[PDB]
Each structure stands twice: as structure tokens, then as C-alpha cells.
Amino acid sequence: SFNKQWYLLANQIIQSLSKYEGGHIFEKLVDAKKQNCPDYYDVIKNPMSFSCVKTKLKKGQYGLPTEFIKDVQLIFDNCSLYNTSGSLVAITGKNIEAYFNNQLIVTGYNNFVTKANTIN
Ligand SMILES: Cc1[nH]c(-c2cccc(NS(C)(=O)=O)c2C)c2c1C(=O)CCCC2
């Protein structure tokens, strides 16, 4: 099935981001008290983590392959927003984002995006 394939591909891609060096910081949502950042959810109004994306792929919340890309990019956009350009967190965010964008090409996930935009 069309939706079954890019669901499978999105699961493999999000799993590789979780195994990427330093990717564990994007796995779960930030605990404001534990991570010593009490203003995180005053700055980030649309939080997103790898586990959030995995749940949506598990429950079947995505209707279009672009919805997966937007949630993942939201993680890296929240990262570059709250974290200073040179910090350790921002560095790893830029690293995984570059890895994620290259995976969308080598896995062919963009092909599901291209065919989906013409359908709609
Ligand atoms: C996307 C993101 N993730 C994390 C995070 C979460 C759990 C554990 C760790 N690791 S640790 C060794 O406790 O510092 C980090 C960095 C943070 C973060 C931020 O936006 C900055 C503020 C909180 C740190």
C-alpha cells in the first residue's frame, strides 16, 4: 500500500535519528525542572520529540508523508530557537537535521512526497 510504505520508511528514518550520536536528547520531551530550563515551554509553544513522532506513526495520525517531515523539522526548529547557535544542543540539532535531510533523499521518502503533492 502507498501509505503503508512511507509509514514503514518514516519508522526506519525516525529510528535512525534515535540511534544517531547525541540523538537521545531529542527522544523524549524536555522536562523543564529536570533539565534546568524552566522557560522552555514559554519559548517553545509546539514541542516535539522523536517519541511523539513514533507514537503518531504507531497510532496512524499522519495522512500525508509531508506531515512526518514537518514534525521532525519542528524538533530541529525548536532546537535552533531555544538554544544558542554554538551550544552543544544546537550543534547536535544541526548535525541530525543534516542527517535527516540526507536520509529523505537516499531512502526515497521525497518520492512519496512528490507523488502525494500531485494527488492533492
Ligand atoms: C532538545 C533538548 N534536549 C535536551 C536534553 C534532554 C534530555 C537529556 C539531555 N542530556 S543532559 C546530559 O542531561 O544534558 C538533554 C540535553 C535539552 C534540549 C533543549 O532544547 C535545551 C534545554 C534542555 C536540554
Residue numbers in the entry: 1 to 120
Which of the paper's sentences describe this entry?
PfBDP1 is recruited to promoters of invasion‐related genes by binding with its BRD to acetylated histones.
Next, we investigated the influence of the meta position. Based on the affinity increase from MPM3 to MPM2, we assumed that hydrophilic groups improve affinity. Based on our models we assumed hydrogen bonds to the side chains of Gln365 and His354 for the sulfonamide variants. Based on the two conformations of RMM23 in the PfBDP1‐BRD co‐crystal structure, this should be possible for RMM23 and RMM22, but not for RMM21 (compared to RMM20).
